[PDB]
Structures are given as structure tokens and as C-alpha cells.
Symmetry: D3
Subunit: 128 residues, 6 copies
């Protein structure tokens, strides 16, 4: 049996929703579904999954001393890193019908359009 998929993330997601990787590059077995973001096992066995998800996260403030509206002194406060990755990998035994997907637990994921910044992939290692 040949089960292997790889998809990237087009659109921004936030909150607690399932990440819907819709830029599908590989999908042997047609077991990944871009409308749901879920891999649904059909061949029972042991599977490898990996994911890389880019977070979308700078503050400044200016205070000027003015005389009759004209600036006589300027000052800035500033404290600007924004883009970072939440990545992991697993190996799981999967029965027929099992769903595997990536879920946000708070925060905002970057939508990379067709650039494949955020990805999700998997393949079967052994079939039962």
C-alpha cells in the first residue's frame, strides 16, 4: 500500500480551528482532504506525520514637546521578533477511520498563499 501526502497552508487561521492545508502537493491514497484539513486512515498501520506552522504575531510610541504647536523636542519608545514556528513530528498506529489533523490552541497562523511556509505531511511506514 502507498499512502503519502504533503500539503501547504494558503489562508490565515486563528483561534482553535483545524488547520486546513489546501495547497496539496502529494496525496497518494487520496487519504488527505483539503476541505477538512484531515488525513483519514484507510489502510490500518503505523504512520509518520510531521508539521511546520508559522505564527503571525512591534510597538512604538512617540511623545513630542510642543511650543504653540511647533515641535521643540521629539522622543520615541520602541520595542519591536514576529514570525516563529510551531513544529513537531509523531509516529502513530492508526486504525481505519482514524482522523489525524493539526489544530490551533490559541494564536494566529500565517497563511502563505502558494509559498508552502506552513506544511503538513505524512506517510505509512508499516501496514497491519
Amino acid at each position: 500500500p502507498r499512502v503519502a501526502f504533503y500539503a501547504g497552508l494558503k489562508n490565515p487561521h486563528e483561534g482553535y480551528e483545524v488547520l486546513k492545508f489546501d495547497d496539496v502537493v502529494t496525496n497518494l491514497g487520496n487519504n488527505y482532504d483539503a476541505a477538512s484539513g484531515k488525513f483519514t486512515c484507510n489502510i490500518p498501520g503505523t504512520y509518520f506525520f510531521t508539521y511546520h506552522v508559522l505564527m503571525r504575531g512591534g510597538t512604538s510610541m512617540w511623545a513630542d514637546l510642543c511650543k504653540n504647536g511647533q515641535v521643540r523636542a521629539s522622543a520615541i519608545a520602541q520595542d519591536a521578533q514576529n514570525y516563529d514556528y510551531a513544529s513537531n513530528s509523531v509516529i502513530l498506529h492508526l486504525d481505519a477511520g482514524d482522523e489525524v489533523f493539526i489544530k490551533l490552541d490559541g494564536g494566529k497562523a500565517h497563511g502563505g498563499n502558494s509559498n508552502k511556509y506552513s506544511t503538513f505531511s505524512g506517510f505509512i511506514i508499516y501496514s497491519d
Copy 2:
């Protein structure tokens, strides 16, 4: 010798492009600082020192988990740090004519409201009368 000197703290949050209205008035010799407008209005023409310290408002990440059938099987975090507190501060010495206004105006961003803690301040005094 005339006596003009003031010192006031900022109670409420301000933001954007507005005059900061320091309303926790600690000193106001000469009564030339007006907490309702945030403006010092010169009475005695002369040379003045002013200084200000304005605290920028600080603030408080993404979790992505792989689940099998809704059960978490791996967790991952990217941490949004940095939105620290920091200060926009300066000092000047200016000649003022009677009726001149001096004030601190924001030019972008969010100033912390300090309640009665006096984190953000504005002060000044006459050095010489004309």
C-alpha cells in the same frame, strides 16, 4: 523673583495623536499648568526648563497540536514575546513669551495610564524672567 514651577503625572491611557493631559498635579506654583488641557501657559516671559517622561503601554503566542481523533498526540508552541514597557523622554530650555503654550503631544502609539503612580510625568520651572 517670580515663582513658576509645576509637576504632574498622567492618570489615564492616551493614544494616537492627542495632547497628553497630565492630571495628577503635584506642584503648580504660579498656577500656569492646566490639567484640563495638558498645557502650560506662560505668564512671566523668560527662559524655562521643561522635562517629560512618558511610559509606552506594554502588553502580553500560537499553539499548534497534532491530534488523532481530537486527542492531542503532539504539542508545539511559537512564543509571541516584544511589547515591553519603555519611555519616550526629553528635556528642553526655551524662551517663552506671555501666552505661549507648552505641552506634550503624542505622535503615534499608546501611553500607559498610570493612575496615581506617576509613571509618566511633565514638569518645568522658570530659570530667568525677561
Copy 3:
């Protein structure tokens, strides 16, 4: 042959010790040992391994006081603290060879059963 494992890190580690991934999810072949944090090869062959290890800010206030009552306050602050050290390898192994993740300074965060820090691998080819 069937060799594949996956485990997460329950407790915090620090310094220069082996990471003992003790939340074992998968262990085909029983070649990963959660008591030692080590995978020990039994079938010689070529093996894939990967790992993700989660690492676990300063403020200071100075107030001007008049007879102990605050007349002005100030804060200095410079608060990112959680980042990952992760990598992947492919290695040929002989029987008896051990593969494990080792800290070389720093503090690894203990994730309880959330599996923030993980270690997994599988055989690609046996010899």
C-alpha cells in the same frame, strides 16, 4: 523488520544530561528505552531519527519617595523565552549502537503529557 518509536518528555532537564523521553506513544520492536532515554539498535540497518526539544525576562522599578511615599515611579523592562532546538538525521547503525538526545547546556522544558518535546525514529532499510 518493524522498528519505530515515538516518545515525549514529561519532566524538565538541564545542563549536560541525556533527555529521557518517558511518555512513550509508540515502540515497535521495543528498542527505545524510556528509563535511559536511549534507542538501542538490534537490527543493523539505516535509520531515520528526528527530535524537537522545547527550551524553557527582566524588569526593574525605581521610585522616588518623599518620607517613604511614592512621588514618581519608573520601570526598566526587557522581557522571548520559549524556543525549539530540533533536527533530523539518517544514520547507519550496527547492533548495540545507541542513539539519544543530549543537552549541551540550558534548560529543557518539562511538558508533562502534552508532548511538547519529542523524539522519534524508524528503520528505513535493514542490513
Copy 4:
């Protein structure tokens, strides 16, 4: 016409909730600032300007995690702890003081850098008006 003006720097590290003892004394007209206590004591009632600049201690601890075969590194990975930067807690006041009133800088948490004789952290003031 009264003459009251002082200026002092912080030689030694302080932390926690203690009074900052500025003991690198540069100017002390009137002898009203006391380095042993960190306190200015009013003797001429009046209106006073004070200002302070206190440097927070900065600090260098990153994490390395390596996959080993038999103790030999076969992959390395670093997660970097950046931040902790030097930064300042500073403010200025104008206050009316009565005789015997004490003015001083007090930490309310954190670690102040000891500057030895470099005068990174400072405290100064002068009388504007006597009553």
C-alpha cells in the same frame, strides 16, 4: 540666597526593595545628601527639583540539544536565549519639602547595576525656591 544642590552615582549593585545608596558623590552643596543612607534631607523648606536615572542590570543562558550516536554528536541544534538588555528607570519631580522631609530612590523589584565610579546610575537635585 540658599545654595542646595547635589549629584551622586551608584557604585554597588542593589536589588529587591531597598533604598539606593548613591555613594559616588560628586556635588553636595549644602551637605543635605547623605551617601550612607541614600537620603536627601530637607533643611531649607521650599520647592525642589530632583531627577534620577537607574540602570537595570543586564545579563547574558541558551540551550543546545544534540543527537548522539554512542556519545558522538551527529546533529546539533540550538535554541537561543537572548533579552537581558541594559535599560533605564528614570524620572524627574518638582516637590515642596518641609524641613526634615526625606527624599530618596527606592527599588520596587529587580536588580540595579553597580557602576563603580562610572556613574551610570545617578540621583541629583537642587532647590528652586526657598519658602
Copy 5:
């Protein structure tokens, strides 16, 4: 068919060049070439690839390419050591080239410590 490689980056890279992983640890099939930084497919099939690139802080982009076509992208953001990493599964034909190339920034040269890595293996042949 046995195709599997793993290599580390020795020297600092920067700009828009292909990352030439020259510290080769594994190379079953001899299909990886440290002199070019390229895996060249001999056996057509479905391949797994992964990479982890250490930025020396000017942000760093690192993309996996098939024949120059981006198939995965990764950023490490300089707002100062951070990683740009990703994994792909791709069908390859004979002669197809897979490699990691920088899209701006500075990649750290890890000597033989293997901070910056590139690996792959064939999952299925055709």
C-alpha cells in the same frame, strides 16, 4: 532500491545561493552531491525530504526546490540565532534535482557540528 542521504553544512552561506551541505554523513545510492548541494533522482518514485537551516542574524529564508521550483519555504526572523526548517514529500522523475537554496539572509557555518542539515530517502519507487 535503497536511496537515503543526510548531510551537514560546514561553511557560512549568504544571499541567494544553493546551500551546499558538504559534511555528508549518509549517502546510500550516491545520489547526493556535496559539491553542488543537490540530490539528483536516479530511481523515479516518491521521496521524503527534510531540512533545518541555522540563521546567523536581516532575516533568513531557506526554501526546498525541485528543479528550481519552490516546494517548501521557511523563515527565520532577525528582529538572533533561529532555524528555517521544513519537510516535503515529492514525486520525482529521473534527473529531477532537489536542493535547498537561500532567499536572503545568512546561514551559519557549523564546521562539523551539523547545525544545518539536509536529508532524504525514497519512500516508494515507481
Copy 6:
């Protein structure tokens, strides 16, 4: 009563270990501050207040700005962001000065922002008392 007071801003970028030449002169009572050298020169012996605020360019990062009397340091300050943000190196002093004494701000590393006429970085002072 002598009248000595100046206030000036920094127009151009500076860097390294040079004297900051604040050349956007707003106030210069007494004509004792010289924008071409960046130096205040004492002509009336007495006790003086000075203050400065130097914005670090946001390209680097640490920057140090020291107030010097005749080249000797009388205050030090550091700006640091180990993100390359704008931040300030600022301090204030009260000093006794003799005739001919020079007071100026000198960089001790890093890059100072050129603020053109916006007066982001400043240097001021005034006489408190004459001897």
C-alpha cells in the same frame, strides 16, 4: 545674577568614540555652548546642571554616551537592544566648573541617530549658582 542656559539638538548621525556636535541650537544664553565643537565652555565659575538624551540608531546593538568634563567622565549611559530598536542613552549631572572647563557628550561605542531638525537627541544645561 548671571544668565547661562543652552539647549541644542543633534542633526547628523554620529558613531564610534567622537564628540556629539549638537548643532540645532534652540537656546544659547551666555554664548557658552559651541555647536562647531559640541562643547560648553565655562566662563563664570559655579555650579551647573546638565542633561542629555541621545537616541541610538535603530543598525546595531549598543550605544554609549558619556558626559565629560575636560575629557573626564562625569556621567555614563547606555542604550541597548540585543531587535535593533531605537532606545536612549540619557543622564543628568550637577557639576562645579572653573573658567575654561569644557563640558560635552562623547560617544563610547555604537551609532547615534541623526534627527535632522526633529530634536530627538538633545543636550542642555544652565548655571545654578555662580561662585
